[PDB]
């Protein structure tokens, strides 16, 4: 049938379409990788280590598909959780601005995403193909 | 609780004295009558008046 | 001071010293100095020039506790106002990049018990 990203679960899509991108290895990893922790309001950096940037691009792909025209600021806000201020009470802190920007550039080089007018990054026509292809694949994968 | 004040219980007795002919043992028609014959400013009080009026008519 | 030896520090321009200094020092100089700092620097220079060989220069009094210690000031005696007195401090090399106010306590230590 006419499968979409929406017809598959969001967890199993990201796990599959991450495993797509890292295996072929066409994606541009930034160089920071082992250093950075992905938010101001994170304590430690990611536990996955060999990966994670692939999972982020797998999210941002799925996210930009469904929404109309997202930017970096909206992505910052999306991923960025609540900082423990030790002894003060918590508050929402927006996530790392560069690393979400490097993902938007990384997905543009493959051509999953493109630069939209009226600001932000819309999903591309080759994007829709690639995401709908893995969507139909991931549906038929599990039984 | 639901205990009615003087103005409810007073004006109910005052209507029934004049219009025991006319009025029924049913709320809906009574409230619509109370608009014409009595000149009430409020809407909520009218529904209170007519409700006790019905309680007395049930006893009669 | 951050590698640079003292002979070199004394020859260095204020601008080049600022490049080596902490963020707060840099930001202050980048915002500009008013006429009041410049007048004080002129007085320090005059006092240092008028000093006999091997004597400490005459103490220059200032209310500017917010002034930063620059290499040019080394060896000068500065009377730093604490709120009621001008305390006298000689600008040693170790004091570079600090505020004048740090070397003049505004309050008297709290001693409990003892009459």
């Amino acid at each position: 049938p006419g499968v979409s990203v929406r017809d598959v679960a969001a967890q199993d899509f990201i796990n599959a379409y991450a495993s797509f991108l890292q295996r072929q290895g066409k994606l541009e990893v930034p160089g920071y990788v082992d250093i950075v922790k992905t938010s101001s309001g994170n304590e430690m950096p990611p536990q996955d280590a060999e990966g994670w940037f692939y999972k982020r691009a797998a999210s941002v792909a799925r996210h930009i598909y469904m929404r109309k025209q997202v930017g970096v600021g909206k992505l910052n806000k999306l991923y960025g959780g609540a900082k423990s201020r030790g002894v003060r009470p918590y508050k929402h802190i927006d996530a790392s601005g560069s690393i979400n920007r490097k993902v938007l550039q990384a997905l543009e080089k493959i051509g999953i995403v493109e630069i939209s007018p009226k600001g932000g990054r819309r999903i591309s026509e080759n994007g829709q193909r690639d995401l709908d292809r893995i969507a139909a694949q991931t549906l038929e994968e599990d039984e | 609780g639901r205990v009615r004040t003087k103005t409810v219980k007073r004006a109910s007795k005052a209507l029934i004295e004049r219009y025991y002919p006319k009025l029924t043992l049913d709320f809906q028609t009574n409230k619509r009558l109370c608009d014409e014959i009595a000149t009430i400013q409020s809407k909520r009080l009218r529904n209170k008046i007519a409700g006790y009026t019905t309680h007395l008519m049930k006893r009669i | 001071y951050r590698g640079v030896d003292l002979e070199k520090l004394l020859e260095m321009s204020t601008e080049d010293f600022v490049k080596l200094a902490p963020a707060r020092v840099r930001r202050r100089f980048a915002r500009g100095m008013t006429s009041k700092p410049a007048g004080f620097m002129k007085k320090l220079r005059a006092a240092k020039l008028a000093a006999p060989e091997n004597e400490k220069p005459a103490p220059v009094r200032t209310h500017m506790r917010n002034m930063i210690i620059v290499p040019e000031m080394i060896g000068s005696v500065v009377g730093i106002y604490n709120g009621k007195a001008f305390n006298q401090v000689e600008i040693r090399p170790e004091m570079l990049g600090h505020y004048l106010g740090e070397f003049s306590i505004t309050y008297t230590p709290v001693r409990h018990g003892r009459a």
Binding site: R6, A9, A10 | - | -
Partner: protein, 141 residues
């Protein structure tokens, strides 16, 4: 044109606007199936509209829901009743009443009480405490 009903539901600030049609048999949410409800437990509370009534009536109706406002568990309950009001508003117009009452009978007799809005709104915080009823701690001594 095809038959159309524009039913809705609500709990708290959630407002789940359903659209039912003469369809093939899709029961959609936002733009995704009923298995796309990430509240793992509260899958079964948006199931109940189509479970406890009859499968057969859900074989010719395109239900799809556009949920806005509220919070995660208020989304579940808003959708639910917009489904369970959708078929009843469909069966009102283009089906027999004696059938349409067996929808309402089978629903309301389960201790469902879909009703409409569960009318419980938040009681305002008033000055002198962190809550509505709760007051700041008093000192005495």
């Amino acid at each position: 044109a095809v038959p159309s009903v524009q039913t809705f539901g609500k709990k708290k600030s959630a407002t789940a606007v359903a659209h039912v049609k003469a369809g093939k048999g899709l029961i959609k949410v936002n733009g995704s199936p009923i298995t796309l409800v990430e509240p793992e437990i509260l899958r079964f509370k948006v199931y109940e509209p189509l479970l406890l009534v009859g499968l057969d009536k859900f074989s010719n109706i395109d239900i799809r829901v556009r949920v806005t406002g509220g919070g995660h568990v208020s989304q579940v309950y808003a959708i639910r009743q917009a489904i369970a009001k959708g078929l009843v508003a469909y069966h009102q117009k283009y089906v027999d009443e004696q059938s349409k009452n067996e929808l309402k009978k089978a629903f309301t007799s389960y201790d469902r009480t879909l009703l409409i809005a569960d009318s419980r709104r938040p009681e305002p915080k008033k000055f002198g405490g962190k809550g509505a009823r709760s007051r700041f701690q008093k000192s005495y001594r």
